[PDB]
Each structure stands twice: as structure tokens, then as C-alpha cells.
Amino acid sequence: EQESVKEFLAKAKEEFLKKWESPSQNTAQLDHFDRIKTLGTGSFGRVMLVKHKETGNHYAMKILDKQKVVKLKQIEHTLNEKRILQAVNFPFLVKLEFSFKDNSNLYMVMEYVPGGEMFSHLRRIGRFSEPHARFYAAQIVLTFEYLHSLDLIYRDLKPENLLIDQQGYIQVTDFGFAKRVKGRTWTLCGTPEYLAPEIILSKGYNKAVDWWALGVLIYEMAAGYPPFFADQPIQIYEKIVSGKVRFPSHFSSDLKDLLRNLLQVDLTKRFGNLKNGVNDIKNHKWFATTDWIAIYQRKVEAPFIPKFKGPGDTSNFDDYEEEEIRVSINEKCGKEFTEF
Ligand SMILES: O=S(=O)(c1cccc2cnccc12)N1CCCNCC1
């Protein structure tokens, strides 16, 4: 580790801790925005393209229903998500611009990234070439180096959470499972195909789960499908815990070697969790052509630029029923969300 990297990360941690200890709160309100379109929807919230009525800027507004967050046992997770997002700063992490709450909902107003999910692009082309997968993987490696140095675990890496920006670079979204952890944590969360064995087996786990998930992501980008696939989750879990993985013959030997070390079922032997930390990944032969500083500085020409007409274009996102944003006349769950 060059003193240069050490000093960068020391400053990053100082700046994160100052915002972590004194979080911003209540920095806009709903009637500052016009609603444009629903971009995504889930069991306790949705994301909406909105336009600020005074500046004209577009944003992605995540709206969480407090009562559904409580029912689905996501209180601490939603508090983690906002407290972390308002404190971080890195080129490949989506920016939180405003946050607020009302009688019914929590609101996180983020930069709008018009290029769409990596998932859509991957499914449309089939698979990414190794150089193309490597460009995205390098951004995730650097992002995890940053997050883990702050004692943060991400826990939701998957192609649907990685958006492609106007320059073709990644923006990581969805901090709903991110957590500040010194040592181990225990919650069962994440998407089946991406879960590390130690999550499935109900162990106290650490940042090594993010490095496992990177292995799954690289495999899926390069093959077009994930390494452990089945019709039902329990069948997926049996494959994950087995210690067996099959690689397409078109994978390079270097790619297969990196993946065996990320998809290592013994967490004490897994790349990213050894004495040399992230450098076992950054120095691997599969990354020999990667200029880490040039990626960080966004000086590498991207594999593709998404096609879109302007900052309000939604063509790279898909269509959802447009439902009301109702705000109750009575405050709900005020105590639970006091710190938001
Ligand atoms: O609309 S999003 O939730 C989304 C979340 C957070 C920030 C965003 C910024 N720009 C666009 C979409 C965004 N998104 C697409 C549909 C669902 N998959 C996850 C990514």
C-alpha cells in the first residue's frame, strides 16, 4: 500500500466520521417537486423521477412507507441507509441530495442516473466481454476498498443495483442493507443468487460477503447468467454451499483463477479477507491491464455510453402502474423514525 493510498483513505474516514456523527436532516419537502414517472417499486416503497420546481433539476426520489417498513422489520435498515448515504462521498456511489419525512413516508432524493440498470444492458446483449466486465468490476473493487475502510458492509451487490451514467461509469444504488460493522453481523438479507455460504448457514459474518458477491457479479457479467441458478431458493443455497462451480469454456484461465478465489466457500481463505486485503484482488493477473488511478479519475473510455436524450429521459427504465403518494393527516410511527 503506497502512502498515497493510506493518506487518501485516512482523509476519507475523517470526512465520513464528521458527517456520520452529525447527520443532515429535513433538507427539502415534497411540494418542492413535481412527480414525473415511477421508476421502480417494491414491498415497502418505490422510486420516482421528480423535477425540482425552482431549479428544474431531475432527481430519483425513493419513498418508503413507514408502516410497511415497520411491518417488514426494516426500521434499523432504513435508518442505516439514510445515515450512511448522507455521510459517504466516492465517484461510483450515488449522491443523496436531500432527505425528509412526513406523516406517512420517508424520502431520499438522489441524483437521477438516466442510463438504466446494468441488468437491462447485460440481458439485452447477452454477456459482456472480459474487458467490459473488468471495467465495471474495477469500479466495484475500488468502491468496496472505500466502504470497507469506513467499517461499512454493502450487502446488496447485484446488477439491478448498478446504474450506468452518462459517461458509461457505474453508480451504486440501494443502501438498504448497508451497515456500519466492526467485526461481525448476523442479519439474513440479500438476494438468493448472491448470498455467501456463511449468510445461508446463519453465521456471524463480515465484509468477506461483499467479496463473494463480487465473484458472483463478475461471473454473471462474463457468462450472462449467475454461477448458482435454480428454480427455488433452497436449490440455489445447496449449490452455493457445495464448494463446486462450473465455468464456461470461453472464460480465460485468469478469470477462472480469480473467481475460484472470490467464490471460495471457506471465508478464511477468500480473496479480500486475507492478510493482504484488497491487494490480492488488485494485483491479480486478471486485473493486470487495469490502471486503478485512471479508473478512479474516470479517465478510461467506457465500453459503451447509454443512449438517452437528456437528463429527463426515462427510456432506459421500464413501466409501472402509477399509484398515489398519499400523506396521512395523522403522524405514523413517529417514535421509530425520530432520527431520520
Ligand atoms: O429506480 S431505481 O430504484 C433507482 C434507485 C436509486 C437511485 C436511482 C437513480 N436513478 C435512477 C434510478 C434509481 N432503479 C431502477 C428500478 C429498480 N432497480 C433499482 C434501480
UniProtKB/Swiss-Prot annotation:
Autophosphorylated. Phosphorylation is enhanced by vitamin K(2). Phosphorylated on threonine and serine residues. Phosphorylation on Thr-187 is required for full activity. Phosphorylated at Tyr-320 by activated receptor tyrosine kinases EGFR and PDGFR; this increases catalytic efficiency. The active site is at D156 (proton acceptor). It is an enzyme of class 2 (transferase). It is a lipid-anchor. Its main location: cytoplasm. Ubiquitously expressed in mammalian tissues. Residues 288-340 form the AGC-kinase C-terminal domain. It holds the Pfam family Pkinase. InterPro entries: AGC-kinase_C, Kinase-like_dom_sf, Prot_kinase_dom, Protein_kinase_ATP_BS, Ser/Thr_kinase_AS, STKc_PKA. It is found in: Cytoplasm; Cell membrane; Membrane; Nucleus. The modification Phosphoserine is found at S129, S328. ATP binds at residues 39-47, 62, 111-117, 158-161. Allosterically activated by various compounds, including ATP. Activated by cAMP; the nucleotide acts as a dynamic and allosteric activator by coupling the two lobes of apo PKA, enhancing the enzyme dynamics synchronously and priming it for catalysis. GO terms for cellular component: acrosomal vesicle; axoneme; cAMP-dependent protein kinase complex; centrosome; ciliary base; cytoplasm; cytosol; glutamatergic synapse. The modification Phosphotyrosine is found at Y320. Residues 33-287 form the Protein kinase domain. Keywords: ATP-binding, cAMP, Cell membrane, Cytoplasm, Kinase, Lipoprotein, Membrane, Mitochondrion, Myristate, Nucleotide-binding, Nucleus, Phosphoprotein, Serine/threonine-protein kinase, Transferase. The modification Phosphothreonine is found at T38, T185, T187. One of its GO terms (molecular function) is protein kinase binding. It catalyses: L-seryl-[protein] + ATP = O-phospho-L-seryl-[protein] + ADP + H(+); L-threonyl-[protein] + ATP = O-phospho-L-threonyl-[protein] + ADP + H(+). Its EC number is 2.7.11.11. A number of inactive tetrameric holoenzymes are produced by the combination of homo- or heterodimers of the different regulatory subunits associated with two catalytic subunits. cAMP causes the dissociation of the inactive holoenzyme into a dimer of regulatory subunits bound to four cAMP and two free monomeric catalytic subunits. Activates cAMP-sensitive PKAI and PKAII holoenzymes by interacting with regulatory subunit (R) of PKA, PRKAR1A/PKR1 and PRKAR2A/PKR2, respectively. Interacts with NFKB1, NFKB2 and NFKBIA in platelets; these interactions are disrupted by thrombin and collagen. This is cAMP-dependent protein kinase catalytic subunit alpha. The lineage of its organism: Eukaryota, Metazoa, Chordata, Craniata, Vertebrata.
